[PDB]
Ligand binder design. Structure first.
Ligand code: Y01
Ligand code: Y01
Ligand code: Y01
Ligand code: Y01
Ligand code: DMU
Ligand code: DMU
Ligand code: KKQ
Ligand code: K
Ligand code: K
Ligand code: K
Ligand code: K
Lengths: 259, 258
């Protein structure tokens, strides 16, 4: 069997076993706490329904209002600042879902917006990421020549790259634990889930004390952090991961080259 | 100025102007509806508070319970089926957020899981995506030779783009049936899923305890998300990927001449 076919089959077997191992661990960590929390909330729901004389239909009518008011609770999510924050989440594939298009026209424009946006943003981060690596490689070469030597190795680049990722999450967690009044660990977890473009939406910045409309300085920092932070991670994947994606094309070209 | 520096600066100017234009359009389409909906719901909130004799504190007390019960309402999200669905959302960067780790140990394992997972998934989709393109290129060459021969880039972009619409439409038809959504809603869900945006406003396997009671539909939803991402992955491998390595190609050419 060809090297390309062995490599692809190995990756499929790897991903599926990684999913089974992952599902096994998340079950061990989250199954029991979820059952405990569900049982606990089922009691509070019955106690509050009894306290304020609420029927099955009465609670259900009140349930619809509370859920529909959730995106409005944070404040105005769709003026210029909120629409820009949303535009960021779309093209960067973060998609928190804290604010999603409620109109059919909004949903349609979002699809066309993402179709051209996501490739543009992806290419931009890989291009700027490469320029950052080229600058770091030049700075390190000049420093080595300065102290007394001079060639910049791949290992030196992986070290600077990995430290840049740690520092970015630490700087972010320092700021988001301050402004969003979270613990350093929570703010760090938010920064990790944001900059990996997972964006669960369990933690979202600019959703407290009408920040999008009343705190422009914090909003400016938040946009600059998300964009610069994604460039730092983007530069690191351009350095380590990207080379493995062109591997099948390199081996296929080599096959035609020999034959 | 070097080609690399002109290209990078052009892309930065492009992205920022695309963000300003985007923010301008979403404001025009969503600002007024949001103000109208906020005002409508605030009337219903006052009417329901009056109907069931509820105070400011009384409503707030029930508000906390309704919001906290939302992830539990869909059913058990953390057994083997729910943890596998969540494991998919993490490594594929979809991250609906319908179920997120509530424990410190869950949050920590999730971070290490993503750190190694996301690059493994990305490499896998680009590798399988390339193999699919190579097969399509072979099938088209054999067909051209058969009917009465070289496969162009333009022919590949056409088959690739049509495969993308076919995967969104097959998905939309299937999800609009099992989730009782409109074709447009199911299509929008398939688009937001396969682009890894994953807002979470529409999430499959969240009705009638599907994760625990409907294994056949759960099996289809796992297979669709994974195959669908391979179809989009193959298109980026063909069209987008070449432009990401362009800076490195130009930098190598600079050292080659000088
Ligand atoms: C902190 C983060 C950014 C680290 C990312 C780590 C990656 C560089 C790793 C994670 C999974 C790895 C892959 C896991 C499995 C394989 C199959 C493996 O296939 C074989 O050994 C058979 C074919 C052959 O001989 O090449 C080749 C390497 C590869 C693609 C690995 C390449 C390196 C990957 C992408
Ligand atoms: C090298 C790079 C990182 C610099 C990029 C330029 C930044 C300085 C720009 C890009 C986006 C800008 C933000 C885009 C949107 C807004 C919302 C804006 O708020 C309003 O207009 C309030 C009223 C409304 O919400 O309609 C205040 C400025 C701010 C934070 C901007 C501040 C300046 C930012 C961060
Ligand atoms: C349906 C989807 C998957 C389609 C994806 C379309 C992409 C192939 C497009 C979208 C934005 C485009 C980019 C927008 C801007 C530029 C800057 C442009 O820069 C210059 O013209 C100056 C430097 C030079 O001469 O190369 C080079 C092409 C590039 C990277 C474009 C390459 C092709 C991109 C990535
Ligand atoms: C190469 C590709 C096209 C095929 C990959 C193999 C599939 C046939 C596998 C991969 C993941 C599997 C699923 C992983 C998890 C589950 C949950 C499982 O449900 C339970 O175990 C119920 C109890 C619980 O949740 O603890 C039922 C089978 C199912 C849908 C599996 C069905 C078979 C699937 C889709
Ligand atoms: C922020 C992003 C910065 C983008 C610019 C980075 C590249 C500039 O560094 C150049 O690298 C070249 C390498 O050969 C050197 O020759 C050149 O002297 C140096 O100037
Ligand atoms: C599902 C994905 C399956 C991917 C399978 C990839 C098969 C590649 O096809 C090969 O292409 C070569 C081109 O030179 C041919 O020579 C060879 O005969 C053919 O087999
Ligand atoms: O934003 C980043 C990024 C993240 C970290 C650091 C810097 C970055 F730039 N992305 C973009 C989103 N994602 C690419 C991606 C797509 C995919 C892309 C475009 C389209 Br269109 C459709 C689908 N599918 C999958 C499936 C599994 C894993 C990854 N997948 C990771 C890199
Ligand atoms: K994503
Ligand atoms: K989300
Ligand atoms: K996402
Ligand atoms: K998401």
């Amino acid at each position: 069997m060809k090297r390309q076919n062995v490599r692809t089959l190995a990756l499929i077997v790897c991903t599926f076993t990684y999913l089974l191992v992952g599902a096994a661990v998340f079950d061990a960590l989250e199954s029991e706490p979820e059952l405990i929390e569900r049982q606990r909330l089922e009691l509070r729901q019955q106690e509050l329904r009894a306290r304020y004389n609420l029927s099955q239909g009465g609670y259900e009518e009140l349930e619809r209002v509370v859920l529909r008011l959730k995106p409005h609770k944070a404040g105005v999510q769709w003026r210029f600042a909120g629409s820009f924050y949303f535009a960021i989440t779309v093209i960067t594939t973060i998609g928190y879902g804290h604010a999603a298009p409620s109109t059919d026209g909004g949903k349609v424009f979002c699809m066309f917006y993402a179709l051209l946006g996501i490739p543009l943003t992806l290419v931009m981060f890989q291009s700027l990421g490469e320029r950052i690596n080229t600058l770091v490689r030049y700075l390190l070469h000049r420093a080595k020549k300065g102290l007394g030597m001079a060639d910049v190795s791949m290992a030196n680049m992986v070290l600077i790259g990995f430290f840049s990722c740690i520092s970015t999450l630490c700087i972010g967690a320092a700021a988001f634990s301050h402004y969003e009044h979270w613990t350093f660990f929570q703010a760090y977890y938010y920064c990790f889930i944001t900059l990996t473009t997972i964006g669960f939406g369990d933690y979202v910045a600019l959703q407290k004390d009408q920040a999008l409309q009343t705190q422009p300085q914090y909003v400016a920092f938040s946009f600059v952090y998300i964009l610069t932070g994604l460039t730092v991670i983007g530069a690191f994947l351009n350095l380590v991961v990207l080379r493995f994606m062109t591997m099948n094309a390199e081996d296929e070209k080599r096959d035609a080259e020999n034959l």
